[PDB]
Amino acid sequence: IGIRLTLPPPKVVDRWNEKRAMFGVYDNIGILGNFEKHPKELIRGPIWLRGWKGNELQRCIRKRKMVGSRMFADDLHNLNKRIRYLYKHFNRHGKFR
Amino acid sequence: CPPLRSRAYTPPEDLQSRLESYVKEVFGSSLPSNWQDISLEDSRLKFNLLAHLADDLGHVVPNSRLHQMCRVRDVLDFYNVPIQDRSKFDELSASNLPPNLKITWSY
Amino acid sequence: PVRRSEKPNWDYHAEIQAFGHRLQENFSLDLLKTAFVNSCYIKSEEAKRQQLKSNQELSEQGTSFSQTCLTQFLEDEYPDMPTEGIKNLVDFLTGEEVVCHVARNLAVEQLTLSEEFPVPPAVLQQTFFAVIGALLQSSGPERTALFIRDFLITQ
Amino acid sequence: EPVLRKVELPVPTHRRPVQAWVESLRGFEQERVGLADLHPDVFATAPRLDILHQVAMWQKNFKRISYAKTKTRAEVRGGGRKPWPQKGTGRARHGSIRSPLWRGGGVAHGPRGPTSYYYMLPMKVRALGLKVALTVKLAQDDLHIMDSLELPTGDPQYLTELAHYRRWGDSVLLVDLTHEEMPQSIVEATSRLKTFNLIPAVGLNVHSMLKHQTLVLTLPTVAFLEDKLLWQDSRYRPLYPFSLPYSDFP
Amino acid sequence: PYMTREQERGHAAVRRREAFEAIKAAATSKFPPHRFIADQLDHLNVTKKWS
Amino acid sequence: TARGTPSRFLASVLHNGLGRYVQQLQRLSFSVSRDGASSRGAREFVEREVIDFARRNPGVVIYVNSRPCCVPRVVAEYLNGAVREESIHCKSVEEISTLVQKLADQS
Numbered sequence A: 001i002g003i004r005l006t007l008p009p010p011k012v013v014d015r016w017n018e019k020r021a022m023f024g025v026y027d028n029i030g031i032l033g034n035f036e037k038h039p040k041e042l043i044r045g046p047i048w049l050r051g052w053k054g055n056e057l058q059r060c061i062r063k064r065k066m067v068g069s070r071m072f073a074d075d076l077h078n079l080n081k082r083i084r085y086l087y088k089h090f091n092r093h094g095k096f097r
Numbered sequence B: 001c002p003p004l005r006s007r008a009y010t011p012p013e014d015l016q017s018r019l020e021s022y023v024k025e026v027f028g029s030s031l032p033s034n035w036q037d038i039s040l041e042d043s044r045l046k047f048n049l050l051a052h053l054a055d056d057l058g059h060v061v062p063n064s065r066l067h068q069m070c071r072v073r074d075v076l077d078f079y080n081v082p083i084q085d086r087s088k089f090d091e092l093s094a095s096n097l098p099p100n101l102k103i104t105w106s107y
Numbered sequence C: 001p002v003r004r005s006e007k008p009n010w011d012y013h014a015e016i017q018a019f020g021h022r023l024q025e026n027f028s029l030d031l032l033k034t035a036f037v038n039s040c041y042i043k044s045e046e047a048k049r050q051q052l053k054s055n056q057e058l059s060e061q062g063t064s065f066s067q068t069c070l071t072q073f074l075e076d077e078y079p080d081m082p083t084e085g086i087k088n089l090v091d092f093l094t095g096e097e098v099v100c101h102v103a104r105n106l107a108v109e110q111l112t113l114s115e116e117f118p119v120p121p122a123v124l125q126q127t128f129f130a131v132i133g134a135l136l137q138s139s140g141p142e143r144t145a146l147f148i149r150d151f152l153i154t155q
Numbered sequence D: 001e002p003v004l005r006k007v008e009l010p011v012p013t014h015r016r017p018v019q020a021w022v023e024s025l026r027g028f029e030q031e032r033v034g035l036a037d038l039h040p041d042v043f044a045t046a047p048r049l050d051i052l053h054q055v056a057m058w059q060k061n062f063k064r065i066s067y068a069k070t071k072t073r074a075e076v077r078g079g080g081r082k083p084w085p086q087k088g089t090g091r092a093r094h095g096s097i098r099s100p101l102w103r104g105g106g107v108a109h110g111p112r113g114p115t116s117y118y119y120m121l122p123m124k125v126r127a128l129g130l131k132v133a134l135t136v137k138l139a140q141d142d143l144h145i146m147d148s149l150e151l152p153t154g155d156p157q158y159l160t161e162l163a164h165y166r167r168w169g170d171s172v173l174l175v176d177l178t179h180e181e182m183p184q185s186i187v188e189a190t191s192r193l194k195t196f197n198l199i200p201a202v203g204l205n206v207h208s209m210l211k212h213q214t215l216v217l218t219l220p221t222v223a224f225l226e227d228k229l230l231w232q233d234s235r236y237r238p239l240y241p242f243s244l245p246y247s248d249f250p
Numbered sequence E: 001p002y003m004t005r006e007q008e009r010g011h012a013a014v015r016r017r018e019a020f021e022a023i024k025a026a027a028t029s030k031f032p033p034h035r036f037i038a039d040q041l042d043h044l045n046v047t048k049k050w051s
Numbered sequence F: 001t002a003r004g005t006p007s008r009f010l011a012s013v014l015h016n017g018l019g020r021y022v023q024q025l026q027r028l029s030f031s032v033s034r035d036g037a038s039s040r041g042a043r044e045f046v047e048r049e050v051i052d053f054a055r056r057n058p059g060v061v062i063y064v065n066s067r068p069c070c071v072p073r074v075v076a077e078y079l080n081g082a083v084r085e086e087s088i089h090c091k092s093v094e095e096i097s098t099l100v101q102k103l104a105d106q107s
């Protein structure tokens, strides 16, 4: 059949937890603070991703050159293969030339 | 702490002469003709006038409408508008209801 | 099935007035109330309360008027008809089933106070004649005659 | 002694300054202790609702990094050999058991790696954003100006009951000038209150202002905001990042 | 027929021409419409509470 | 589809037009919410039209409930005893008004 037969437990979302309350504070660190820091210095996450944006192919190129040495053997083989795939896809395939 | 006070306001009958009194206090006893024309460009006098009116009448000019009070006439015309403060259930219940209509309230 | 009184969004007072207004009849509301309150109900009510006037007068007057009114109409329309004929024809019109049909679709049963739901047809018929009797006291013979014509003759 | 405040930075000729009532937190009945003039360009500009949306959307999305990934057909374990010959059986032809079609297979077009959604709105746009948000607060009687965020006591129930008495609303944003020189009394009070929030001036943003029903500012902070937001127009284009020394910036 | 060829020559030319200007005028008057502030602010009404 | 669905013959209740016309709509039940966009359209219907509508047809008893709900609705009840439910939901005052008229002039 494949449809639930009772209502799931109700979800309560605390809109006034500390994380929700102080969301987006210091986004104006630059203009309000003499330009000591760019807002892109509030970004946390991957080394190859802090304050940068690109398509999949570009992201892979970047991860290869920035954390390529330090990554695991099989992971890196997977990444080298990804790049090979995407290279052919983007250069040789598609609707428009 | 004092109890919360109602936002309801009815303009009094002697508003004209009460404003006469307040202006002649703040701007001094000597008063030129057409006192409605007196400009409130002066910041200090504006404050003094509006404070006296706010303390006694109970109703205050909001932050939004303050720059609109350019002249004394503007203050007079502002205080002659009434504010009636009640929930929408109360206002509808006593709003000349036809007897067939019924309104209930589950809040 | 339970009576509409025992269901959400119900005020009997406002409904009573609307019953008057639906039929474009200026009823005396006090009398109309008195028309809808059965004797069976008051006995049950007394017994229940243990742990107000009957319909009797209004109902009798209603039925007696309707009988005479209907004969008048029928004798004027069909003069060649015999006495026994029109007797049976009025009796059909003032019948249990047909009058209760009218009652049902005029929401008489909705405002009827009875011990038993759904309402026994004897009681419902008695209640309908009480309505006519109250209307008779309300707006004289003329208006009531028009009401009979508009409801019973049409059957 | 009435508390009067004028605008230090020069105003345009055609524009006139707006006024705001000045109140203090010291008493419940200590509204209307002073009057203030605000610069019309910051506090009385055109309501641009598109700009609020623009800035708000940038604020929500620019920090976001996606952590979702899925394995493609190449990345799924096994699936080397051809399951059976093409021609021979009655079966539908396959090249690998890990194809998208198969159960247990890799994903055809799935979430791919850590993804960044970082972009920058232009500076002048974010500045204008702050301006609109501030006008909108004062237009709708949601903005309040205070001499100081000084409290008679650190008891957090005093602050709640004052907001109730002054019809501020359920959520209040408190802004002070500097983080270090924030009063003891307000910090104690606001620390254990969910809906009331204390930020320094540099913290202020569009999102919080929209989230909170009230915006409360100090007289120090109002002069500061005017300075910086008004600086944004009437400046040149940069030759180099403004963090570097100029002949007149900081 | 009624008029000969000579008679009808240029008899309708004015009406023909002035009709073509009507076309050109309409063709040359397609432009983006006016943006009003009234509708933009009206989007606030979506949250309009009873109390 | 005609085969796929039931049929009736044309009728009225109790030969409506014959003697006097009787309005068949007897009761109307409006469920609205104090807050929330769904009931917004309906909210202002109760601001203006409800009152004059109720005057226009004294036969109908109107009940307005005003309780929290994600979908505002109207329950039309008829003399014969049919019940028609209609979800007003996110509808403009004007298209809500058209609905309420359409209900009132049918059996």
Ligand SMILES: [Mg+2]
Pocket: D074, D078, D079, D080
């Ligand atoms: Mg493989």
Ligand SMILES: [Mg+2]
Pocket: D095
């Ligand atoms: Mg293959």
Ligand SMILES: [Mg+2]
Pocket: D082, D086, D093, D094, D095
């Ligand atoms: Mg193959």
Ligand SMILES: [Mg+2]
Pocket: D071, D104, D105, D106
């Ligand atoms: Mg899998």
